[PDB]
Amino acid sequence: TTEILPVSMTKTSVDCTMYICGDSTECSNLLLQYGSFCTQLNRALTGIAVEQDKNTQEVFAQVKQIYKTPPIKDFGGFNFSQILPDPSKPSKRSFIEDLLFNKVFNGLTVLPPLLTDEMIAQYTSALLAGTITSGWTFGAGAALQIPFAMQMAYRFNGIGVTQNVLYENQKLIANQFNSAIGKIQDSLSSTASALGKLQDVVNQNAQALNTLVKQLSSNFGAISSVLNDILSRLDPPEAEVQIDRLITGRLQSLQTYVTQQLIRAAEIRASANLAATKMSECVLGQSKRVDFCGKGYHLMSFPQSAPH
Amino acid sequence: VKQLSSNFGAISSVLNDILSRLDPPEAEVQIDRLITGRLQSLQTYVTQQLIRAAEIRASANLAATKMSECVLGQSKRVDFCGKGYHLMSFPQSAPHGVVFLHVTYVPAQEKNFTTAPAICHDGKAHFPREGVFVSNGTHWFVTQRNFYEPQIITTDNTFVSGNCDVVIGIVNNTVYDPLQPEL
Amino acid sequence: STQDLFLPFFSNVTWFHAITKRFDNPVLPFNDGVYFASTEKSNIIRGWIFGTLLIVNNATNVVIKPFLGVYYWMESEFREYVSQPFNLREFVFKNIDGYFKIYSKHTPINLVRDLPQGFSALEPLVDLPIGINITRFQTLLAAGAAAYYVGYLQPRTFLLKYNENGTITDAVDCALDPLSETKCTLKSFTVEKGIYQTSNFRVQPTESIVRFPNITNLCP
Amino acid sequence: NVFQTRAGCLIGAEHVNNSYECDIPIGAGICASYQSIIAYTMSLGAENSVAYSNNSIAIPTNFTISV
């Protein structure tokens, strides 16, 4: 089955002085009177941005050592080509990450993510090759080899069935598993409103940036929305009333972006906390927690990366 | 506290000065600018505290789940309580938080041995009841999975379900019967 | 963190030496303020004359209405507030809002080097409400061992550390090294490992191109 | 020593072709540390490969209790 969980959101910063004023000494002098409002906001957006790189680290960086899959793949009748890294493409992206990724100004800067999408995919390949080659053992203490046809049979004796069932029906279980991973590429390709959960986080952030940039084109009650014109065509004593209307208005638009981002950063932190728990209790072990990890009894789970 | 020293556009940041040195109709214009700004400043503190209180309620709720499942019982959830297999955890208070000392058993000194899915004796496939069949080069033994305690394969530690044909990997070895020597 | 006219740390202070015969009573313009570390063992350097109106601060008295030929001492040199009749001396003179403010500290330890390296803050000495303008100044002296160093004060932001008895004991100029700017942002004299944002770099414009059309027929 | 990175331009640090754990995080896979200040691509972790074979298991033979 498949669970798409958001872990991180774009890290963006707004320089308040450039947004509220804009290359104008006259506006900057009025703005300093208001106080530390301008330096309180820049710290909030820095807090959302650092936490957006602890969210990615906790979900993926649970493996201290990078494990590597054996050169000849003889996992007992099981084929994991559609989950294991394929060297022809980005070389870190398997047949399903590439499918997943493809399916997905002024005072404003977007800071770059610390773990590039390749390093996020060398972590997923460690977790996958450690699990196919070791089992629950990699994430507990030292990593110990077990033949895959026998890692399952210990995962089928945790759902209550006995070992004889896997060894007697190993060819059927292998063909049932290989065929089912294959449909997951059709399901996440031909028909995915599944990637919607990750996409709404991209869309909702962009509609909020678009609203901030548009508010720079609203008078708020001054003669004009352009700082140069108010200052150029008015005497210096009476322009200050008109700039103060823009500064109170433009500052209110930035406070609404920062509060709404602090509220939406918190929802992504809860999704990053469930994704870290699902990596440790489902990829790194077998869960008896009903429906935490799939509808059915749980045998194994496999991490795959996504745009965010 | 340091935003009570900002004009917010008024003549002065101190209420007594505005009231004393300006006429009462004019002062209300200057006083209002302070009231609007010093109220936006309180509204921002309260709103950030309301968002920060929720981060603490989530840590307070995870700490209560760790006390019940980790202090008052053993947990099979992986990495909820320490890296390793959980044995017990002890609760210790801190200024405004709790520190939990999580005891865990981390396995060590691994050794590699050859193993088989089942062992065939008398045309029947004997599978390990609880354990792994392992070989020290020449002899086959049943050992527990998480520690090496080699033991002789007997009817007591093995169950029979089938014939040598279905399992791929069956090795052939002798499974002892405790009764035959006594009989 | 205080914003005021302070002498930038690690600056070039013009050094005038009275040694041969070398006479230094010239045109030093008081652009904003003037630090003045006169160091004189024989007390030859005794006064300063300020002008646009002269706020003379002679050895005898401050009178608000060219050298002193003082010898072993004639004092009739000229080209009304009045005041009480009267090593390194580090006077700082500023003229803000019409008050001439002078701050000074005499350091008992003598200077083996031309200027010692230490933080000695200057305690306010006097403020006079002259209500006048000063544009240039000149020293007044009795050559002997005479060394007066004049460095003009500039607008700057400094973080000053106050001890427990109120004495400034350290300061960090916050426009010098990148580390000094970072210390002001964190409001601490000791930083810790990390990447800390300090400011914003904006490429400033160069010219002002104004382009209208070719234009057609003028007025008849 | 000017170096151009995806997260900006870093002046004052020398690129080292080696790789190590991240100390101060500059961004886009580049970190920096006192060697001088050296800018290096981050190393995700050691690289180890479990033997893996159709017929080989490894069984722990001792334990460690760890608080």
UniProtKB/Swiss-Prot annotation, chain C:
Domain (BetaCoV S1-NTD) ranges: 1-186
Cite the record's note on assembly. Binds to host ACE2. RBD also interacts with the N-linked glycan on 'Asn-90' of ACE2. Cleavage of S generates a polybasic C-terminal sequence on S1 that binds to host Neuropilin-1 (NRP1) and Neuropilin-2 (NRP2) receptors. Interacts with host integrin alpha-5/beta-1 (ITGA5:ITGB1) and with ACE2 in complex with integrin alpha-5/beta-1 (ITGA5:ITGB1). May interact via cytoplasmic c-terminus with M protein. May interact (via N-terminus) with host bilirubin and biliverdin, thereby preventing antibody binding to the SARS-CoV-2 spike NTD via an allosteric mechanism.
Q: Which parts of this chain are annotated as the region Disordered?
A: 202-218
Q: What is the effect of changing residue 89 to S?
A: In strain: Gamma/P.1
Question: Positions of the region Putative superantigen?
Answer: 163-184
Listed as disulfide-bonded, the cysteine pairs are 174-184
Q: What is this protein called?
A: Spike protein S1
- Outcome of mutating residue 112 to G: In strain: Omicron/BA.2, Omicron/BA.2.12.1, Omicron/BA.2.75, Omicron/BA.4, Omicron/BA.5, Omicron/BQ.1.1
Q: Which gene encodes it?
A: S
Question: What is the top-level taxon of the source organism?
Answer: Viruses
Q: What is the effect of changing residue 3 to H?
A: In strain: Omicron/EG.5.1
According to the record, glycans are attached at 12, 58, 133, 165, 206, 208, 214
Counting on the full-length protein, the chain here runs from 50 to 337 of 1273
- Listed result of changing residue 133 to Q: Increased resistance to neutralizing antibodies
Question: Tell me, what does this protein do in biology?
Answer: Attaches the virion to the cell membrane by interacting with host receptor, initiating the infection. The major receptor is host ACE2. When S2/S2' has been cleaved, binding to the receptor triggers direct fusion at the cell membrane. When S2/S2' has not been cleaved, binding to the receptor results in internalization of the virus by endocytosis using host TFRC and GRM2 and leading to fusion of the virion membrane with the host endosomal membrane. Alternatively, may use NRP1/NRP2 and integrin as entry receptors.
Outcome following mutation: residue 27 to A:
In strain: Omicron/XBB.1.5, Omicron/EG.5.1
